[PDB]
Amino acid sequence: GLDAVRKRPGMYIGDTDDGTGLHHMVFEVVDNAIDEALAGHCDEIIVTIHEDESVSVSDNGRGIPTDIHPEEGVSAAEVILTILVGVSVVNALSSKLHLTIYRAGQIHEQEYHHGDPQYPLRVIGETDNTGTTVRFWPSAETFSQTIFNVEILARRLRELSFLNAGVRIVLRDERINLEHVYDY
Numbered sequence: 001g002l003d004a005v006r007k008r009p010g011m012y013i014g015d016t017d018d019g020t021g022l023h024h025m026v027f028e029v030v031d032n033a034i035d036e037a038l039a040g041h042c043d044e045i046i047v048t049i050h051e052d053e054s055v056s057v058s059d060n061g062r063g064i065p066t067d068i069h070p071e072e073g074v075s076a077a078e079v080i081l082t083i084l085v086g087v088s089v090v091n092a093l094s095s096k097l098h099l100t101i102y103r104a105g106q107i108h109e110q111e112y113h114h115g116d117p118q119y120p121l122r123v124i125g126e127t128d129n130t131g132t133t134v135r136f137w138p139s140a141e142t143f144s145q146t147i148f149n150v151e152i153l154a155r156r157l158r159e160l161s162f163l164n165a166g167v168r169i170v171l172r173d174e175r176i177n178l179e180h181v182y183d184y
């Protein structure tokens, strides 16, 4: 039910003007990667602010399940990204979101626009790795400001590194060629 989110985003992501809601978009995706670390599946998270102002979060966890969900008739990954904070809220309020999954020897991908899948999750190659990459462009129709602040992200990643000592958290800002490694 992502229509309701796109109609009243403040109720799901918080303040869409003061920068708190915008950065909550990144935090929600990072929190999913952190949950993979808490369960003992993930020990590296890479958070990138791209030149195009998009943000990528890569983990080396199990990868979001790709098998069809019987109740929905689509990949589990699509059900997680499209049905109702939940990464589906990030998807709903993103002009574009690109999902890559490394799982069971295969690379899977899906792209969305305002949370609508452009095509069903598809196999695009082979991999010896496991994990999830989410890259998203926050919607300017939802957020009055869309530029991520490296200092706001860094402070939260420092906290998460402290609270999750076994996880190597890499922060990259391509706009200023910054890389910081947080690892307790």
Ligand SMILES: Cc1[nH]c(C(=O)Nc2nc3c(O[C@@H](C)c4ccccc4)cc(C(=O)O)cc3s2)c(Cl)c1Cl
Pocket (backbone or CB within 6 Å): 029, 030, 032, 033, 036, 057, 058, 059, 061, 062, 063, 064, 065, 076, 080, 087, 132, 133, 134
């Ligand atoms: C950056 C990033 N990483 C992840 C990420 O790794 N999530 C994973 N979730 C699972 C998992 O729960 C699924 C079925 C589930 C997720 C949400 C709500 C209800 C259900 C099950 C399994 C499994 O059984 O193997 C694996 C994973 S990995 C997300 Cl989401 C984002 Cl965003």
Ligand SMILES: [Ca+2]
Pocket (backbone or CB within 6 Å): 174, 175, 176
């Ligand atoms: Ca620059």
